[PDB]
Amino acid sequence: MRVVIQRVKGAILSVRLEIISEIKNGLICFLGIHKNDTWEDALYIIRKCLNLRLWNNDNKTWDKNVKDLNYELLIVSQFTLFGNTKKGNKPDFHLAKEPNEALIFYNKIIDEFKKQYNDDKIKIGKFGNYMNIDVTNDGPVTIYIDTHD
Amino acid sequence: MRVVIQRVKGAILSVREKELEIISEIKNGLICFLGIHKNDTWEDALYIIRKCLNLRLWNNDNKTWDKNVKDLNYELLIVSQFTLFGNTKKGNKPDFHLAKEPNEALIFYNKIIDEFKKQYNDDKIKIGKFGNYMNIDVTNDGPVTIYIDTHDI
Incomplete structure (x- = not known):
């Protein structure tokens, strides 16, 4: 999986x-699911979204995570992250997992986000539909992870 | 050089002092979170500007992924984001050691913002305060997120 994390x-x-x-405060996460992702890839992303210290605390920087501060997470499935744009100007989404197997996998990713953090702290969207998202970028702080590294 | 491009x-x-x-x-356009690696050559910047300016991330009446920023007469907001080289392999606290030292990073970033203006309309490119803390309200249009690392290419 790939993920873009922004602090909001x-x-x-x-x-x-x-x-x-x-x-309110917390993290928006654009999560792309690759065609060959293992439940392991999921885990690494969940475990990184939830534990990453992305807030300052008194006079410390990069100290507190989203759980620590009782903050929330908005998880949005974003296939366009596997948009290869290396060859020509028309993004090529071949690496991206198919919408159906995607939705089921993504769902399991939400279950787990809930099991690990909290049922009321994980917000989602409507998978595979045009969404409008107003995002109050705080910082801003953008974190990228490709879990093939 | 790394960029996150979200369509908006x-x-x-x-x-x-305060607020x-x-x-x-x-308005309609792209926001581009641009992180600059410590060993970035001008050719890394060119690829970034090009793709930002040329990628067809807009549907066009009947056709998808067809029109780019300039065709639709749209804008760009170019925000430096060193956090893109946040290294989250190590632990839970990210170290950005791979990012370009902020004094030369700033030099490079402005050269880039010029080239942006040059390669499109100069009155169509907006930016933010390089050094500073910022608040960006973003109407994400899709959403549509695109990642590019020049060091792959």
């Missing part, structure tokens, strides 16, 4: 526009 |  003072997620998700 | 309806950048001021605003 809040995010509102709307669909065709109907609001359907909100978070 | 608009984005409003603000800096910080915020909007210094940058774009």
Whole structure:
């Protein structure tokens, strides 16, 4: 899996526009699922989203994680991350896991986010639908992880 | 050189005695979080500018992934993000050692912002305060996120 993590003072997620998700402080995570991802790839991403110290605490920097501060996470499935753009200007999403197997895997990723942190702290979107997300980028702080490293 | 490109309806950048001021605003376009590696050559910058300016990340009436930023007459907001070279292999605390030392990073970033203006419309590129802490409200349009590391290419 690939993931883009941004630190936010809040995010509102709307669909065709109907609001359907909100978070106050915390993390928006754009999670791409690769065609050959093992439940291991999931784990590494979950375990990194939840434990990464991305907030300052008094006079320390990079000290506190999203759990520590009782913050929330908005998880959005983002296949366009496997958009190879190395050859020509038309992104090529061949590496990206197919929408159906994707949805089931992504769901298991949400279950686990809940098991590890908290049922009420994991917010999602509507998988495979056009979404509008207002994101209050705090910093901003963007973290990239490709779990093939 | 690394960039995260998220497609947007608009984005409003603000800096910080106490609370915020909007210094940058774009409507329909791209926001580009641009991290600069310590060993980045100008050719790494060129690929970044090119792809940002040329990738077809917009559907076009009946056709998908077809129109780029300039075709639609759109804007860019170019924000330096060293955190992109945050190394999260080690532990839970990220070390950015691979990022470019902020004094020369700033030199490079402006050269880039020029080249951005040069290679498109110069009045179509907005930025943020290099050094500083920022607040960016972003209407993500999809969302559509695109990652590029020039060191792959």
